[PDB]
Amino acid sequence: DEDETTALVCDNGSGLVKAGFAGDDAPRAVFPSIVGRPRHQGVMVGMGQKDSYVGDEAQSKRGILTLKYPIEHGIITNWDDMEKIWHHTFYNELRVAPEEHPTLLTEAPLNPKANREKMTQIMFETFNVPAMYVAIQAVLSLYASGRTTGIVLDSGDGVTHNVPIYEGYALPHAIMRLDLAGRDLTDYLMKILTERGYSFVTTAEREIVRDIKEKLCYVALDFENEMATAASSSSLEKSYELPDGQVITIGNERFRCPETLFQPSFIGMESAGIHETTYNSIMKCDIDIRKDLYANNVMSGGTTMYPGIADRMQKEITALAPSTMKIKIIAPPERKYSVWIGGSILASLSTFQQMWITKQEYDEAGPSIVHRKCF
Amino acid sequence: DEDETTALVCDNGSGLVKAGFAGDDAPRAVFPSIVGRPRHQGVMVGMGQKDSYVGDEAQSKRGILTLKYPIEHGIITNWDDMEKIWHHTFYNELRVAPEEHPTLLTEAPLNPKANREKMTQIMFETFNVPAMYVAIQAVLSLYASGRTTGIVLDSGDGVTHNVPIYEGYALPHAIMRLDLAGRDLTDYLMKILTERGYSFVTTAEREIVRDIKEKLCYVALDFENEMATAASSSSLEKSYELPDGQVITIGNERFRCPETLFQPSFIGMESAGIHETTYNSIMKCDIDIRKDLYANNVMSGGTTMYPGIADRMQKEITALAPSTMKIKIIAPPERKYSVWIGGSILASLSTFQQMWITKQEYDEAGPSIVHRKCF
Amino acid sequence: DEDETTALVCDNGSGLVKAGFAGDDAPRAVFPSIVGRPRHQGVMVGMGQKDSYVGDEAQSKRGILTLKYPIEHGIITNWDDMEKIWHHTFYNELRVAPEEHPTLLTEAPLNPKANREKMTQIMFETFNVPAMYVAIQAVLSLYASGRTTGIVLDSGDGVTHNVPIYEGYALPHAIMRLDLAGRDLTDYLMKILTERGYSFVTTAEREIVRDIKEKLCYVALDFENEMATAASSSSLEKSYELPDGQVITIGNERFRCPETLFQPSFIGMESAGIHETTYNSIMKCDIDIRKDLYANNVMSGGTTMYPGIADRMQKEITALAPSTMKIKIIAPPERKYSVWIGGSILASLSTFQQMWITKQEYDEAGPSIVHRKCF
């Protein structure tokens, strides 16, 4: 017990952190990974004039901020903010003490040697956690699927990826990435709205554009019919209500914004997203593994979650792929949190006492062991 | 004992003083802060030529006096009138010997350094009280509400005020004063009662119109339905008996005077009243305030008390505010007295023996220490 | 002539409307966008029961009326009120027959388009104007500067904006609206005056504090020093007398409010103010047009007319900008009407007989052709 369920899992995600204990099905703490600092002196009536707090406190909610998004594009960018974040992860969010709990964290698909180490320097030297672990975001998604071989295509908030997996780890020459994903299409949804209207330009009109992404967005299975069919009498017309009585008629719009992730092109770079990108990821992968991977293409993230995406993947990657390979997407129900759940199962596991990085090993060898125990 | 409840508390309020001791629920002395002086060499009563009268004395004998008001616009203008008043406060009202009682005097929330220092001068250097404290009114009103988390919107008699507090650090650029309040409203009630027919000609016809305000009046929860239906058959008629048996019927007048505190404007520019003035005791500074403020919006003072003001505030700030904030007003029972009460409870506090400004601290260091021990 | 001078222009701003004819240097009608409605049945001196008043006439009757603001944040939220405004704009304000008059009406930087079109319905279907145009406000401020290319910051009433225009094409991907502007930076100044020493009595006096910003208010070149400096001996001290004998000794206040536009502050509204939000508008638009953006940064609008604001802008954006790139503000003398002057010239234009959206095209194809004629 004392290790086995007290183990923690804390996905440092591209916009939101997911923390908890191990062997929980779904995260104990979820928060926008943002800290900031005063542009002016200012107090309320409350307690004592503090320097920086974190998350939904400073995001739903950021006036005197200088917003720092310290984990940009899934690689922890600022470490004074990150530390404050983990302080908030324990002594606010999980209501626990660091020296008591081993932690499992996730990292970037190409997290550099020394950043993985920088994580480990802080987690022992300020946080003093008794044991710890960090595993790559993608391997944990395929592990939440529970397949040892495959190809994960992660398009969460600030990063799109493709990582083959076969019997244990990843393949960095195949591994694709893209810096435009779950965020970038929400603002773009505001454009397509602001070609319809909209107008959404308060903060409270901008952060609701986000939610309209989550509901009203679809991925068009054939844009040729659909876009044109929207403008007759038809359907496509849906609506939302504002904080007041104004209806938000959105029709010939709903499907335009996800389509982007299925061909992001922009004047003198072509940022080919989701599909051809798998074919070229697997075409850099092992030739004997390819077959399985064609059938074991799995998705994860916020912006893999739009309605229509799986069918849309199913037709597309096939048209590209060599017709003897039985191809098939695995995009499970829980695929916005899978990165974490893989972690949870990876910690509450009878074998895992071997794979912990401990107190002692750290003092003896220093952070490079956390690289060498991984690969 | 020798300090504890020998400790005095004395609110210098814009028209009214509240003196007393530490550890009392309700003020021991209360008087109208008028200073009279005869316009005639009139050898008076059981003692002949008197230079002055203070409190109700000055209010009876007005016809022979000139009336002075030292705490005008929140602050201590002339220090001979003040000192006369405090001599009345101790040597007449409280009946104490000044040299055995620590005092607490209050201070107007934008009380200049030297003005705090000048209360500090007179208490020790002439009154010779062994110890003292000067206290930011909105911090005493705060405390009394069992909270340090809560924005005082003081609106007394000659003052409106919104002061936000960081455990003492009362923000020096969100604090507000706005002098249109209980006095402006009383003269308004006279005005409207005259349009109605009536003649508030003499002093005996004039000071009754104040008390009518204090009790018979209301704040509309919507000004349409009220200020239409009242002019018919309906309700809303109330009546007062005079110094004689002539009844004074008030119906379309009653609820206009408190309404004023919310909505002036006519034609020109763009400005605020209570609600918008609390929407910019909002827009000011700190990132991690807000969620506290909107839910913990307090009120205090003489012109806060008229029936309807809480529910009227509660709709109003909410329509202005972005609709993710859980908003809630707080308007306590005793809210023309809180200013003193939390004062009193703050002097009978076990933590306070560091805080008292003493004889010695003053002979060693002198005046500024009262400010420097606080802000 | 028959088209040329008889063309109208009517900038529907978030508080004030600006109207007139083609060619004219300065607007023929400037009115408050106040539809006021009665809470009463009754008759005025010589005039019977009307359902509404619009502009100044409504404002004068406040006590008996309910006011609304239909063009909140720049966007037409209620169409009963809007239609009432335009009906007043022709049949009262511009004193002409609409069916003889092409009209040019502005629209917010990213307006609604279902609303550009709803505006296109009412103007033909009820006001039968022979032709008309709807024009993007900020594009008309760069058009008052006679340029095809430049980034425009328009901070008018409850509108603040950043628009990058390249060769007559307003890039919707960088367009900020901020929601702290000419109003918000008055209502606050209102009360800091009152903190010091003031009050505003009854139904009218709220609306003197825009004139106070527009005349007195300074943008300090350093806030830390100036804050202390004001409270020493120093200067800052000047005074404004009322329409009665109350002097407004404002000194220590005068600089604090224009400063707000260089980073508005509280919590549930991010507002990196003026400087960073331009940088983050420009950096959404490409380098080969960034050279023309940094040289061609523009400001129109009431509150960007501040004493200090150009010089402050000049230091403040440059501290964020990549260092060799040459910057200079385009903030011309007439920058509180520019939006209408863009319109007036754009009607008085030899080429425009192809660019009128005609009587006929409307009956054949309907409203969206007015957005499709724009692009």
Q: Spelled out in words, what is the top-level CATH class assigned to the domain B32-72?
A: mainly beta
Query: Which residues, listed in sequence order, are joined to residue C36 by a DSSP beta bridge?
Result: C53, C67
C-alpha span between A222 and A220 (Å, rounded):
6
C-alpha span between A265 and A284 (Å, rounded):
23
Q: Which residue has the tokens 């928060």?
A: A31
With contact defined as beta carbons under 8 Å apart, do C133 and C362 qualify? no
Which of B 173-212 lie inside 8 A of A, CB atoms?
173-174
Tallying the residues shown for chain A, one arrives at 375
Superfamily (CATH H level) for A5-31+73-138+338-371:
ATPase, nucleotide binding domain (3.30.420.40)
End-to-end CA distance of chain C: 28
Residue B319 touches partner C, C-beta closer than 8 Å: no
Distances (CA, A) of C250 to B108, B205, C196, C217, C246: 19, 39, 8, 10, 12
DSSP state of A337: S
Token pair of C102 as six digits: 């092409």
Q: Spell out which residues of chain A touch residue C267, defining contact as CB-CB under 8 Å.
A: 61-64
Do the domains C139-185+275-337 and C5-31+73-138+338-371 match in fold?
Answer: yes
Grouping H, G, I as helix, E, B as strand and the rest as coil, residue A130 is: coil
Residue B7 touches partner C, C-beta closer than 8 Å: no
Token pair of C351 as six digits: 């080429």
Q: Spell out which residues of chain B touch residue A242, defining contact as CB-CB under 8 Å.
A: none
According to the 3-state scheme, what is the secondary structure of chain C?
CCCCCCCEEEEECCCEEEEEECCCCCCCEEEECCEEEECCCCCECCECCCCCEECHHHHCCHHHEEEECCCHHHCCCCHHHHHHHHHHHHHHHHCCCHHHCCEEEEECCCCCHHHHHHHHHHHHHCCCCCEEEEEEHHHHHHHHCCCCCEEEEEECCCCEEEEEEECCEECCCCCEEECCCCCHHHHHHHHHHHHHCCCCCCCCCCCCHHHHHHHHCCCCCCHHHHHHHHCCCCCCCEEEECCCCCEEEECCCCCCCHHHHCCCCCCCCCCCCCHHHHHHHHCCCCHHHHHHHHCCEEEECHHHHCCCHHHHHHHHHHCCCCCCCCCCEECCCCCCCHHHHHHHHHHCCCCHHHCCEEHHHHHHHCCCHHHHHHC
Query: Which residues, listed in sequence order, are joined to residue C239 by a DSSP beta bridge?
Result: C249
C-alpha span between A33 and A52 (Å, rounded):
13
CATH architecture of C139-185+275-337: 2-Layer Sandwich (3.30)
C-beta atoms of C270 and A62 within 8 A: yes
C-beta atoms of C113 and A196 within 8 A: yes
Q: For residue B355, which of B125, B108, B139, B164 has the smallest C-alpha distance?
A: B139
Token pair of B114 as six digits: 């030297």
C-alpha span between B354 and B350 (Å, rounded):
10
With contact defined as beta carbons under 8 Å apart, do B147 and B124 qualify? no
Q: For residue B49, which of B57, B41, B37 has the smallest C-alpha distance?
A: B41
Tell me which residue in B181, B228, B266 faces C40 most closely, judged by beta carbons: B228
Kindly give, in sequence order, each residue whose CB lies less than 8 Å from that of residue C257, ignoring residues fewer than 6 positions away. C185, C186, C188, C189, C192, C213, C217
Question: What's the number of CA atoms in the CB half-sphere (13 Å) around residue C69?
Answer: 14
According to the 3-state scheme, what is the secondary structure of chain B?
CCCCCCCEEEEECCCEEEEEECCCCCCCEEEECCEECECCCCECCCCCECCCEECHHHHHHHHHECCECCCHHHCCCCHHHHHHHHHHHHHHHHCCCHHHCCEEEEECCCCCHHHHHHHHHHHHHCCCCCEEEEEEHHHHHHHHCCCCCCEEEEECCCCEEEECEECCEECCCCCCCECCCHHHHHHHHHHHHHHCCCCCCCHHHHCHHHHHHHHHCCCCCCHHHHHHHCCCCCCCCEEEECCCCCEEEECCCCCHHHHCCCCCCCCCCCCCCCHHHHHHHHCCCCCCCCHHHHHCEECECHHHCCCCHHHHHHHHHHHHCCCCCCCCEECCCCCCCHHHHHHHHHHCCHHHHHCCEEHHHHHHHCCCHHHHCCC
C-alpha span between C240 and C232 (Å, rounded):
21
- Going through chain A in order, the beta strands assigned E by DSSP cover 8-12, 16-21, 29-32, 103-107, 131-136, 150-154, 160-166, 169-170, 176-178, 297-300, 329-330, 357-358
Alpha carbon of C302: minimum distance to chain A alpha carbons (Å): 20
Q: For residue A318, which of A326, A307, A310 has the smallest C-alpha distance?
A: A326
Q: C267 to chain B: nearest residue by CA?
A: B287
C-beta atoms of A199 and C111 within 8 A: yes
For C98: left if phi > 0, alpha if psi spans -120 to 50, otherwise beta; the answer is alpha
End-to-end CA distance of chain B: 29
Grouping H, G, I as helix, E, B as strand and the rest as coil, residue A70 is: coil
Amino acid identity at B194: T
Alpha carbon of B280: minimum distance to chain A alpha carbons (Å): 12
Distances (CA, A) of C125 to A7, B123, C83, C111, C120: 69, 78, 12, 21, 8
Q: Spell out which residues of chain B touch residue A37, defining contact as CB-CB under 8 Å.
A: 287
Please report which helix (H) or strand (E) contains residue A144, including its range: helix A137-145
Query: Which residues, listed in sequence order, are joined to residue C299 by a DSSP beta bridge?
Result: C153
C-alpha span between A259 and A218 (Å, rounded):
9
Given the DSSP bridges, would you call strands A29-32 and A16-21 parallel, antiparallel or unpaired? antiparallel
Q: What is the DSSP string of A80-95?
A: HHHHHHHHHIIIIII-
C-alpha span between A62 and A77 (Å, rounded):
20
Cα angle C5-C6-C8, degrees, rounded to a multiple of 5: 100
Selected for mutation to probe chain A from C77, C79, C110 (highest A CB count within 10 Å) is C110
Q: Spell out which residues of chain B touch residue A63, defining contact as CB-CB under 8 Å.
A: 283, 285-287, 290
Other beta carbons within 10 angstroms of residue B350's beta carbon come to: 6
Grouping H, G, I as helix, E, B as strand and the rest as coil, residue A178 is: strand
Other beta carbons within 10 angstroms of residue A324's beta carbon come to: 7
Angle between helices A275-282 and A309-320 (to 10 degrees): 50
C-alpha span between C350 and C366 (Å, rounded):
26
Token pair of B148 as six digits: 């340090």
C-beta atoms of A198 and C112 within 8 A: yes
Cα angle C19-C23-C27, degrees, rounded to a multiple of 5: 25
C-alpha span between B106 and B84 (Å, rounded):
17
Q: For residue B9, which of B161, B141, B165 has the smallest C-alpha distance?
A: B141
Chains touching B (3+ CB pairs < 8 Å): A, C
With contact defined as beta carbons under 8 Å apart, do B343 and B106 qualify? yes
Grouping H, G, I as helix, E, B as strand and the rest as coil, residue A265 is: strand
Q: For residue B300, which of B163, B112, B160, B153 has the smallest C-alpha distance?
A: B153
Kindly give, in sequence order, each residue whose CB lies less than 8 Å from that of residue B363, ignoring residues fewer than 6 positions away. none
C-alpha span between B33 and B55 (Å, rounded):
6
With contact defined as beta carbons under 8 Å apart, do B13 and B71 qualify? yes
C-alpha span between C82 and C265 (Å, rounded):
32
Q: Resolution, rounded to a tenth of an Å?
A: 9.5
Q: For residue A202, which of C176, C115, C114, B277 has the smallest C-alpha distance?
A: C176
Tallying the residues shown for chain C, one arrives at 375
Q: Which residue has the tokens 């027919």?
A: B197
End-to-end CA distance of chain A: 28
Given the DSSP bridges, would you call strands A103-107 and A8-12 parallel, antiparallel or unpaired? parallel
CB burial readout B189-211, b (16+ within 10 A) else e: bbbbbeeeebebeeeeeeebbee
Largest CA distance in chain B: 72
C-alpha span between A309 and A311 (Å, rounded):
6
Other beta carbons within 10 angstroms of residue B99's beta carbon come to: 10
Distances (CA, A) of A4 to A315, B318, C326: 43, 48, 61
Kindly give, in sequence order, each residue whose CB lies less than 8 Å from that of residue C309, ignoring residues fewer than 6 positions away. C219, C258, C261, C299, C331
According to the 3-state scheme, what is the secondary structure of B198-260?
CCCCCHHHHCHHHHHHHHHCCCCCCHHHHHHHCCCCCCCCEEEECCCCCEEEECCCCCHHHHC
Alpha carbon of A49: minimum distance to chain B alpha carbons (Å): 6
Given the DSSP bridges, would you call strands C297-300 and C53-54 parallel, antiparallel or unpaired? unpaired
Compute the count of residue pairs across chains B and C with CB atoms less than 8 Å apart.
142
Distances (CA, A) of A233 to A252, A333, C113, C116: 12, 34, 19, 21
Alpha carbon of A83: minimum distance to chain B alpha carbons (Å): 18
Cα angle C66-C67-C73, degrees, rounded to a multiple of 5: 145
C-beta atoms of B163 and A45 within 8 A: yes
**Omega prior to A198 cis, within 30 of 0:** yes
Q: For chain A, which residues make up each domain, given as ranges?
A: 5-31+73-138+338-371, 32-72, 139-185+275-337, 186-274
Q: Spell out which residues of chain C touch residue B285, defining contact as CB-CB under 8 Å.
A: 265-266
Grouping H, G, I as helix, E, B as strand and the rest as coil, residue A321 is: coil
Token pair of C63 as six digits: 């006590």
Pick the CATH number of A186-274 from 3.40.50.150, 3.40.50.850, 3.90.640.10, 3.90.228.20: 3.90.640.10
